[PDB]
RNA sequence: GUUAUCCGGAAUGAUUGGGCGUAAAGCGUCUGUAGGUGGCUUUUUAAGUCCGCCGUCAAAUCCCAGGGCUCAACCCUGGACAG
RNA sequence: ACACCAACGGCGAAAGCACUCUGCUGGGCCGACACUGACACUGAGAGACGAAAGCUAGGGGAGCGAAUGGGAUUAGAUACCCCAGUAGUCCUAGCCGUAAACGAUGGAUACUAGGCGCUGUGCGUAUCGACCCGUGCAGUGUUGUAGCUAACGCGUUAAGUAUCCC
RNA sequence: AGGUGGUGCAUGGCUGUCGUCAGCUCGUGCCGUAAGGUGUUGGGUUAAGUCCCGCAACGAGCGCAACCCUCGUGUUUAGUUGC
């Protein structure tokens, strides 16, 4: 009980929030019928450096801060290797959410659906092209690119798997 | 409903103002008096300041008759606010409290003191979330604000309750926050509350602050 | 170097396993041979990942750090605490709470509150008060006494955490998979070497093979101290 | 500061565990004096129940499993058995249901054996680990104190 | 701006690209004709398949590159992948 | 019509099938190489069978029992309750071809943890004989890893991974 | 100016009621994709979510109880206008 958290909120240039969804979720009592907030807040610096994160409460910005807090546990770093770019097309569904990712020329901007384009300029991203497939859910749809963009490998790492020295690689 | 904390706690821990030993007919004659005292401060002060610029915030008026002499006490947070620079505030409630006592000629000592805090003193508080949220600003801004803002000076528990007819709206809600222990029955405990009623444009709306100390 | 013998965890209770239709078969290309209701544990790969574990223990001490060991089972409960007053680590007494590794702010205090009761307890100004208070101090401290009593020297989380075999704490083996933290703990012949990242399967039926791979810990540790 | 701190822990031991996974290689009586779980004394059998034999070892109660006796090549008796005989038995499973201790004489137990190279600096270290033992064990007292002054974990 | 017509969005007719326990949907089950798909090795022809070359698929359109109208629209010259 | 036997049991493609015995006859499972050498799977249209109620023809008719009739409850009762009771129920020869005909899951092959079971056979142990242990398969069931699924759940008998056909 | 004119479904304050009933939630953690649950459930025991044990829960706030008044018994002190 310190005051105010100047030190303490972090201030947050490390990591750039925003909601992707505030829907306002109720449940009834036998008193009758009362509702707190869901908002849905994905956390990430250009860098390469994203995740979602839901909340509840019966606040707003406790709601929005509260699935940050549960974001920034919640991270993966984004396999980019090129001119800010993706190695190479993905698809992976949760849930009923499907995504098709697939990379881009780069004078192309991030060309998705609102969940899947608010997760990829999160993560830095420039050059890449995405089609939902499937749900209008946003949760689900945007955890389900953060599945489809863990299970995605470079050129290096593969090279590194296969055993194969070095070629059929223009850069 | 629930009863009120300085109603309920008078036998101990929380003394009365209006501190004069008196008979019947004088009772009521007494209570007159007090009420025109109490009258014209609040009436002063708000007329006297209101050209003046912030808020004041005068949390209690004690009355006391020792001898045919009244001494009364002003506990307001911001008392240089009040005073015309040699003593000429005072000086000046001192005549018009005059105006309005002088059946029997008894001399009165207006004095005024300091709050310790002001932030801890719910009338004072209140005082500060009725005239920001009486200008265009939100609940939730103003309340936290209010919040932190006396959690930045010293008070143990808080309980805000701010009313009906919150920004724009044409149905009334109650909007109350806690931090902390408010035990409201605990008859030890030591909660100052107070209950503002602040007129707005588009309505009333109603403060009620607890705060456990 | 951290040798052991093959002969002398080959006499002891460490491939005396366990029951021979219930095991896990996550063990299929580990376990040797079966023999009368018992299972028979492979003693090569237990002792390479023993090696492996007594490299990973003293070289994470040896960076400096502190460990924790859990004891639960009371099988195994004081076998723990004299496997660690001497190595210096703080340990589970007799029981777990879910939540003392990952909801460890609550802990943190109930530590707050467990740490100013030991001061009062210490004091003398314990027979003040009457049989009530006194009463309710000694319940309270009780049970703090039974799973803060052993983990007081301790503020944060562990390197590396080593448990009670794999039955009774899923609770504190998963809290650790929620962090992160690596552990090194014992397998049974029907368990997962898959929970933590290294273990060391033996069978802990033996008191003296809970004896003999903790001990063996314990002076990895000490040694991971003499700096 | 701390956070990535714990990454790099994680990448250690995630590598750790990266290295080597490749490459390398009656009764109600006895419950009654059951009220506490220490002290081994040479098994005392006071029951006799195939599926096992049941046995006051000190003042713990053990269980003792057929095949976990000895073998029996003998002319007459009954296989698991034992009446009040007080036989050497080692601390095993220990069971779990009711705090009881199980006792094994796990067999011949002969094993294949696979050479194991620096042997030589492997007989070394298990002397450097017996002598280590040898040193270990202490009976009396409790570290403790140490004084140093007491201060908040925040 | 509204309306109408068409395509998209629509993976809402699905080869790329859907489904059938309970959401729309497995015949009541079985025999079997036509038809569809089909084990392994060795050999032969090449119908499919693939590669080269050649003919043609008018001109205009679309794509690339030039050129002309003050630019563009439009006009013109040459070239070609597909298929 | 067939009590106890009757079992989360056996068989049939499904519907179904139980008092016993006999006759004719289908189908399944297992072994040895004993034989042929891909003869395989599915199946449009087609054909067969297909609980119960229904109908034609003739028997038969104890119990039960639509409709009906009477009594009761009820404001009322064409209904639940009760007493009589016809078609029907059973059989012969047909027709009808529908059912929550349900595992609410078309069929076939190959592959992918286990535990606990049951049924049928096969090998070894043990005795030399009934057991009893492991097993090789086929079928039936119950919890359950992976994976799938909107979830519930399914999970070697998949609702898993794939291929084919309607 | 005055309004005991209208709207208590524009309000404040105040109050009744379910009911002095024993609950209602929150923080952190865990589970579920999620609404949510978990705590607060279970074994006892209370007038009580009162308390104790086990438990992926650990704690906390308002609730209950106590501290508040009065009537109960006694001590110390003061005795008038009271004995």
């Keep these: 009980g310190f005051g105010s958290k100047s030190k303490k909120e972090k201030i947050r240039d490390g990591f750039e929030e925003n909601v992707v969804q505030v829907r306002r979720v109720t449940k009834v009592v036998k008193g009758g019928k009362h509702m707190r907030f869901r908002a849905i807040v994905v956390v990430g610096d250009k860098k390469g450096q994203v995740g979602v994160g839901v909340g509840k409460a019966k606040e707003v910005v406790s709601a929005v801060q509260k699935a940050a807090v549960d974001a920034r546990r919640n991270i993966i770093t984004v396999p980019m290797t090129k001119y800010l770019t993706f190695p190479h097309r993905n ?43 499937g749900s209008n859910n946003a949760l689900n749809n945007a955890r389900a690119t953060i599945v489809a963009v863990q299970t995605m490998r470079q050129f290096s790492d593969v090279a590194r798997d296969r055993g194969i020295p070095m070629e059929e690689l223009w850069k | 409903q629930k009863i009120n904390p300085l109603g309920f706690r008078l036998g101990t821990t929380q003394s009365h103002y209006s501190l004069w030993f008196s008979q019947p007919k004088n009772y009521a004659e007494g209570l007159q008096e007090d009420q025109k005292i109490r009258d014209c401060i609040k009436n002063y002060v708000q007329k006297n300041t209101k050209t003046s610029s912030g808020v004041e915030g005068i949390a209690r008026i004690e009355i006391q008759k020792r001898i045919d002499l009244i001494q009364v006490i002003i506990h307001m947070g911001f008392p240089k606010l009040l005073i015309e620079n040699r003593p000429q505030g005072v000086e000046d409630l001192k005549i018009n409290v005059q105006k309005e006592l002088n059946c029997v000629n008894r001399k009165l000592n207006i004095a005024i003191t300091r709050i310790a805090k002001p932030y801890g003193d719910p009338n004072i508080l209140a005082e500060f979330i009725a005239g920001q949220l009486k200008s265009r600003v939100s609940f939730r801004k103003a309340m936290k604000k209010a919040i932190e803002l006396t959690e930045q000076a010293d008070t143990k528990g808080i309980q805000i309750q701010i009313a009906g007819r919150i920004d724009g709206k044409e149905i009334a809600r109650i909007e109350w926050i806690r931090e902390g222990r408010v035990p409201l029955q605990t008859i030890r405990a030591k909660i100052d509350y107070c209950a503002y009623t602040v007129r707005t444009i588009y309505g009333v709306l109603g403060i009620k602050i607890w705060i456990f100390m | 170097y951290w040798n052991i013998n093959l002969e002398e965890m080959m006499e002891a209770g460490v491939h005396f396993g366990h029951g021979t239709r219930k095991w896990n078969p996550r063990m299929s290309p580990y376990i040797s041979a079966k023999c009368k209701g018992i299972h028979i544990i492979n003693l090569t790969r237990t ?21 924790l060991i859990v004891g639960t089972k009371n099988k195994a409960a004081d076998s723990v605490a004299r496997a660690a007053i001497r190595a210096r680590c703080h340990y589970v007494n007799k029981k777990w709470l879910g939540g003392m590794l990952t909801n460890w702010s609550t802990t943190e205090t109930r530590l707050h509150k467990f740490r100013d009761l030991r001061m009062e307890q210490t004091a003398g100004r314990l027979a003040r008060l009457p049989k009530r208070d006194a009463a309710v101090v000694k319940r309270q401290l009780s049970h703090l006494q039974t799973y803060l009593g052993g983990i007081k020297y301790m503020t944060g989380l562990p390197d590396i955490v080593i448990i009670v075999d794999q039955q009774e704490e899923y609770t504190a083996l998963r809290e650790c998979i929620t962090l992160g933290i690596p552990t090194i703990c014992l397998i049974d012949t029907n ?37 | 500061t701390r956070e990535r701190q714990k990454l790099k822990q994680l990448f250690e031991d995630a590598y750790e565990r990266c290295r080597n996974a490749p490459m390398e290689g009656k009764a109600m009586a006895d419950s009654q004096a059951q009220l506490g779980i220490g002290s081994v004394v040479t098994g005392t059998v006071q029951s006799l129940k195939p599926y096992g034999a049941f046995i006051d070892i000190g003042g ?5 499993h057929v095949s976990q006796i000895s073998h029996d090549r003998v002319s007459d008796i009954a296989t698991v058995l034992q009446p009040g005989d007080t036989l050497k038995v080692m601390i095993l499973s220990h069971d779990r249901e009711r705090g009881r201790v199980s006792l094994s004489t796990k067999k011949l137990e002969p094993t294949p054996g696979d050479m194991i190279r620096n042997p030589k600096l492997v007989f070394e270290k298990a002397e450097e680990m017996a002598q280590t033992f040898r040193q270990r064990i202490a009976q009396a007292e409790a570290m403790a104190r140490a004084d140093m002054l007491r201060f908040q974990p925040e």
Excluded: H, W
């Design chain 1, 91 to 133: 698809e992976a569904d949760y849930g009923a959410a499907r995504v098709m990712l697939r990379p881009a020329a780069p004078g192309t901007g991030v060309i998705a659906g609102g969940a899947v384009r608010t997760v990829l300029e999160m993560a830095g991203v420039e050059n890449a092209l995405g089609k939902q497939l």
């Design chain 3, 47 to 67: 002792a390479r990942f023993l090696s492996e574990a007594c490299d990973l223990v003293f070289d994470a001490s040896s960076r400096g750090k502190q460990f």
């Design chain 3, 191 to 227: 368990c997962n070497p898959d929970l933590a990242d290294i273990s060391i399967p033996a069978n802990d039926d033996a008191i003296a093979s809970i004896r003999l791979i903790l001990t063996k810990l314990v002076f990895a540790i000490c040694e991971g101290r003499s700096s």
């Design chain 4, 60 to 64: 713990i109660n053990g269980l003792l």
